[PDB]
Write a protein that holds these residues in place. Structure first.
Motif, PDB file in Angstrom:
ATOM      1  N   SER A 248       0.886  -1.409  -0.011  1.00 47.66           N
ATOM      2  CA  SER A 248      -0.006  -0.108   0.051  1.00 47.66           C
ATOM      3  C   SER A 248       0.941   1.314   0.098  1.00 47.66           C
ATOM      4  O   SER A 248       0.203   2.390   0.075  1.00 47.66           O
ATOM      5  CB  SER A 248      -0.943  -0.004   1.269  1.00 47.66           C
ATOM      6  OG  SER A 248      -2.134  -0.568   0.514  1.00 47.66           O
ATOM      7  N   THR A 249       2.194   1.212   0.041  1.00 48.36           N
ATOM      8  CA  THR A 249       3.070   2.344   0.090  1.00 48.36           C
ATOM      9  C   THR A 249       3.576   2.960  -1.472  1.00 48.36           C
ATOM     10  O   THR A 249       4.314   4.008  -1.415  1.00 48.36           O
ATOM     11  CB  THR A 249       4.261   2.130   0.897  1.00 48.36           C
ATOM     12  OG1 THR A 249       5.112   1.007   0.199  1.00 48.36           O
ATOM     13  CG2 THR A 249       4.067   1.777   2.387  1.00 48.36           C
ATOM     14  N   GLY A 250       3.167   2.267  -2.312  1.00 47.84           N
ATOM     15  CA  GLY A 250       3.296   3.102  -3.564  1.00 47.84           C
ATOM     16  C   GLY A 250       2.141   3.978  -4.212  1.00 47.84           C
ATOM     17  O   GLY A 250       2.158   4.782  -3.560  1.00 47.84           O
TER      18      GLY A 250
HETATM   19  N1  LIG Z   1       9.852  -5.556  -7.299  1.00 47.52           N
HETATM   20  C1  LIG Z   1       9.306  -4.986  -6.308  1.00 47.52           C
HETATM   21  N2  LIG Z   1       9.959  -5.795  -5.055  1.00 47.52           N
HETATM   22  C2  LIG Z   1       9.628  -5.360  -3.862  1.00 47.52           C
HETATM   23  N3  LIG Z   1       8.988  -4.194  -3.632  1.00 47.52           N
HETATM   24  C3  LIG Z   1       8.274  -3.436  -4.712  1.00 47.52           C
HETATM   25  C4  LIG Z   1       8.498  -3.891  -5.978  1.00 47.52           C
HETATM   26  N4  LIG Z   1       7.892  -2.848  -6.700  1.00 47.52           N
HETATM   27  C5  LIG Z   1       7.343  -1.897  -5.718  1.00 47.52           C
HETATM   28  N5  LIG Z   1       7.807  -2.387  -4.536  1.00 47.52           N
HETATM   29  C6  LIG Z   1       7.255  -1.857  -3.328  1.00 47.52           C
HETATM   30  O1  LIG Z   1       6.009  -2.113  -3.001  1.00 47.52           O
HETATM   31  C7  LIG Z   1       5.233  -1.236  -2.322  1.00 47.52           C
HETATM   32  C8  LIG Z   1       3.984  -1.317  -3.021  1.00 47.52           C
HETATM   33  O2  LIG Z   1       3.890  -0.518  -4.067  1.00 47.52           O
HETATM   34  P1  LIG Z   1       2.771  -0.772  -5.487  1.00 47.52           P
HETATM   35  O3  LIG Z   1       3.583  -2.018  -6.173  1.00 47.52           O
HETATM   36  O4  LIG Z   1       2.556   0.515  -6.318  1.00 47.52           O
HETATM   37  O5  LIG Z   1       1.592  -1.400  -4.682  1.00 47.52           O
HETATM   38  P2  LIG Z   1       0.527  -0.486  -3.590  1.00 47.52           P
HETATM   39  O6  LIG Z   1       1.118   0.794  -3.285  1.00 47.52           O
HETATM   40  O7  LIG Z   1       0.241  -1.521  -2.353  1.00 47.52           O
HETATM   41  O8  LIG Z   1      -0.752  -0.581  -4.384  1.00 47.52           O
HETATM   42  C9  LIG Z   1      -1.907  -1.024  -3.842  1.00 47.52           C
HETATM   43  C10 LIG Z   1      -2.913  -0.460  -4.629  1.00 47.52           C
HETATM   44  O9  LIG Z   1      -2.514   0.277  -5.907  1.00 47.52           O
HETATM   45  C11 LIG Z   1      -2.913  -0.856  -6.753  1.00 47.52           C
HETATM   46  O10 LIG Z   1      -2.081  -1.604  -7.179  1.00 47.52           O
HETATM   47  C12 LIG Z   1      -4.187  -1.612  -6.122  1.00 47.52           C
HETATM   48  O11 LIG Z   1      -5.448  -1.000  -6.993  1.00 47.52           O
HETATM   49  C13 LIG Z   1      -4.277  -1.426  -4.659  1.00 47.52           C
HETATM   50  O12 LIG Z   1      -5.176  -1.027  -3.888  1.00 47.52           O
HETATM   51  C14 LIG Z   1       6.102   0.294  -2.585  1.00 47.52           C
HETATM   52  O13 LIG Z   1       6.708   0.664  -0.994  1.00 47.52           O
HETATM   53  C15 LIG Z   1       7.366  -0.076  -3.333  1.00 47.52           C
HETATM   54  O14 LIG Z   1       8.681   0.042  -2.830  1.00 47.52           O
END
Ligand SMILES: Nc1ncnc2c1ncn2[C@@H]1O[C@H](COP(=O)(O)OP(=O)(O)OC[C@H]2O[C@@H](O)[C@H](O)[C@@H]2O)[C@@H](O)[C@H]1O
Length: 172
Positions: A120-122
């Protein structure tokens, strides 16, 4: 001894289960979600469809588990983290639940090791700091109460975040 922080790409980690930060559709997206699907190949999407077809949208805070295809893991746990909205929409709980239900699913499937990204931090825009607190508190308290999973990996995409966890961890 049981919880570890590692810096890097979650798709490269040889653990029993890798956790995906998915969205309700389960269908794909970007961030970890895209990376995972890319790494896994088409089998993952076939599988996510079968699931979808069977239970519809995966509600926020809950999780599902599927095969992992080409990934070095045995399975992928798709969990739906909350979208951040100021912190007055029960987000902290929903984030908790995402971690919890993920863990429960790992256990229920007799898996011993699991890797978590920073759910959820992206794109979802959860304040990086509060999130890590929940992630660490939730996972820690859980593994305290349970034999399974044996090992947990917090996978962090950058050094900044990794240090965050590292500290929060040894801060208890
Ligand atoms: N290859 C990777 N490996 C590890 N961590 C990663 C990678 N890519 C991104 N991250 C980390 O994952 C975290 C989550 O980022 P996102 O991948 O954008 O997912 P998130 O923020 O949970 O998005 C969740 C929300 O967005 C939509 O995907 C969906 O609709 C959901 O409600 C971030 O802090 C980022 O540093």
């Amino acid at each position: 001894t049981r919880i570890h922080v590692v810096q890097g790409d979650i798709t490269k980690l040889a653990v029993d289960v890798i956790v995906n930060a998915a969205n309700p559709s389960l269908m794909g997206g970007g961030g970890v979600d895209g990376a995972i699907h890319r790494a896994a190949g088409p089998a993952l999407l076939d599988a996510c469809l079968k699931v979808r077809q069977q239970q519809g949208d995966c509600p926020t805070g809950h999780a599902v588990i599927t095969l992992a295809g080409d990934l070095p893991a045995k399975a992928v746990v798709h969990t739906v983290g909350p979208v951040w909205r100021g912190g007055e929409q029960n987000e902290d709980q929903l984030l908790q639940d995402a971690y919890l239900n993920s863990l429960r699913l790992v256990a229920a499937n007799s898996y011993t090791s699991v890797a978590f990204p920073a759910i959820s931090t992206g794109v979802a825009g959860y304040p990086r700091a509060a999130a890590a607190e929940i992630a660490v508190k939730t996972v820690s308290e859980f593994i305290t109460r349970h034999a399974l999973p044996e090992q947990v990996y917090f996978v962090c995409y950058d050094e900044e975040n990794a240090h965050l966890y590292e500290r929060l961890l040894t801060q208890q």
